[PDB]
């Protein structure tokens, strides 16, 4: 329970529901956050505008 349950969800890779923008998600295999292009499909909360925030909320 050290990090929120949504940290373990796959971000919506390649899904376009609008503009693609720089984003960061927690990668549960690397156990750290990783850049990706977010297309506004708000399927879950595993996406952050900054690397640091992602690593704050989810890294642990």
């Amino acid at each position: 329970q050290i990090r929120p349950a949504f940290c373990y969800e796959d971000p919506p890779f390649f899904q376009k529901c609008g503009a693609f923008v720089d984003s960061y998600y927690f990668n549960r295999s690397r156990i750290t956050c990783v850049h990706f292009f977010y297309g506004q499909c708000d399927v879950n909360q595993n996406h952050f505008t900054t690397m640091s925030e992602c690593n704050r909320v989810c890294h642990g």
Partner: protein, 410 residues
Amino acid sequence: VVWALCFMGSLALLALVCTNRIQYYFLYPHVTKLDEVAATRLTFPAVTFCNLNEFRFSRVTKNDLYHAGELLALLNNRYEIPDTQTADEKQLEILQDKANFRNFKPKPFNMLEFYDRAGHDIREMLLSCFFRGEQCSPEDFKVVFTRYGKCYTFNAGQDGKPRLITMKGGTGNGLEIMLDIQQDEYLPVWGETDETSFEAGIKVQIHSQDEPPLIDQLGFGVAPGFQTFVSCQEQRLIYLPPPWGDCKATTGEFYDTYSITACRIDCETRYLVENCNCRMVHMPGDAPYCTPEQYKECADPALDFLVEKDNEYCVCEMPCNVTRYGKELSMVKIPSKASAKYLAKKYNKSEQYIGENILVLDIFFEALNYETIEQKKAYEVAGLLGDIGGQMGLFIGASILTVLELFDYA
């Protein structure tokens, strides 16, 4: 009066249309456009090939066997020839002597050096090579290390050498190589490891010079005892970057241009360094090279896991530029009965040897035409304005003139 009622109600409906059109622009949509492009030339691709056998038997020394014998299943964990060995008479005698480590002092050992030295030599494999009627030679092939070991790339276009071109469809305008896969040099197979296989032949990958090979994953095979024809079609796929699409242009981690294969090799390298504290000898970077014990215990399993099982560690962003080669393969037999003695005598081998070891490979294009599949921006600024002004005319009757009138009036 009621006119003003109808004018503003009509204008309200015009407003909701313009909001639709404007919100749609900010989706940055795209459509995909197909095109057949006629061409006077094509850049011939790079062609990477590997022997399926990684180490030449006659090049394995007592020291090699000491360090790498267990990895290659030639030795058990007691550094001895296993009783579950399945060898002939003569090879066994050679290996039994080679495995005699009584009063032997081990010397330093390195897998990259072992691959470079014991791996098959293009100078012996390449019996002949022609490209567009011109004779080529071992110097036209660049050494590249892959999971197969010491492999070779024709037309790599690296080190300041220019890329070659084709100008007509058909076999005469491509590559033809004759190879000896050298089965008498194949390492005896006594067990199952990642470094050995049950198969004889080569693995081949045809790819853009801008992308490294991933030949264990993405190659095709070619068998001894055949001439194999590979008829190719070039296909160029173009994707849009953000905000329209999600393609990646460059990267500044181990390679110049970005490609899926570059991404995968970066990931694989990071993964091995992270989990094993070492890199396999074909991977880029600075980490120390895995010892044979590390290959067996940590590196092979970790790479296998990543390449087969893992679903999350590496997820690669699509590149903006992809060149794909569609391929149609077919085969005829070599040697004919009528030509076997000629080949045996010309290469000083028996006729049976020729039949088990020689292959010919032809790689050429069906036609110069390449297909392009491209994402295009679907609704740019121009399309937005001309649309809004076209709706203004529909709802009110407003013009470019009408506007500059009432804008000067107020």
